[PDB]
Amino acid sequence: GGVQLAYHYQQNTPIGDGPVLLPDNHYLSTQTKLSKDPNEKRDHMVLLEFVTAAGITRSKGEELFTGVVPILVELDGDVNGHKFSVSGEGEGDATYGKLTLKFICTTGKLPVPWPTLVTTLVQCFSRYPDHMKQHDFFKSAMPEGYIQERTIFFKDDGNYKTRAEVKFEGDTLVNRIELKGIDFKEDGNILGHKLEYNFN
């Protein structure tokens, strides 16, 4: 149908033993714009993202997000034996659900399409409306942080399994990720780089 489907299963577990908010059922609405730095020779992705919690008409951690917060992202990846590393930096403004980040493949050519890594590469920067404050698990787990685990099934192709630790290092929000990808078809849409450079 002109698209490649990627089904995400996700679970998040607090790292610390302090109180967290367990939410009522809801969803995050995410828009993402991908671009390139004309002066950047390395394989890279520039990302502008806005995320807003929604779905309900109606702790100390959210205090850490009232202003602009610097972000660091580090990913270690293995897809079908292809090793690669990605570093990102930028900032988040949860008041506006806003992320601005630049990611670099530090090992050379990224062996998978950038758009397949977007979801892996900090939902604590989501904008929770005022009437929805009590459902923001992500900020409530801070600063000690949370573990984010996913499996991503690419329909008719391979899968990613990810484990990430998201927590504060001083004033900086850090996302450290390990990604393992398996059973990808060598000339499929992922390893064959058949995806458009964008994200809807």
């Binding site: 490649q4 089904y7 299963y9 367990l22 969803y27 397949t116 939902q123 058949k194 809807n200």
Partner: peptide, 30 residues
Amino acid sequence: SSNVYIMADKQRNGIKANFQICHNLVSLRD
């Protein structure tokens, strides 16, 4: 615009999420 559906996971004192991402294919490869 994607939608991430979030639900509490009381057992792990955390949350569960499930969603679908749709990646566009380039043309003229098939």
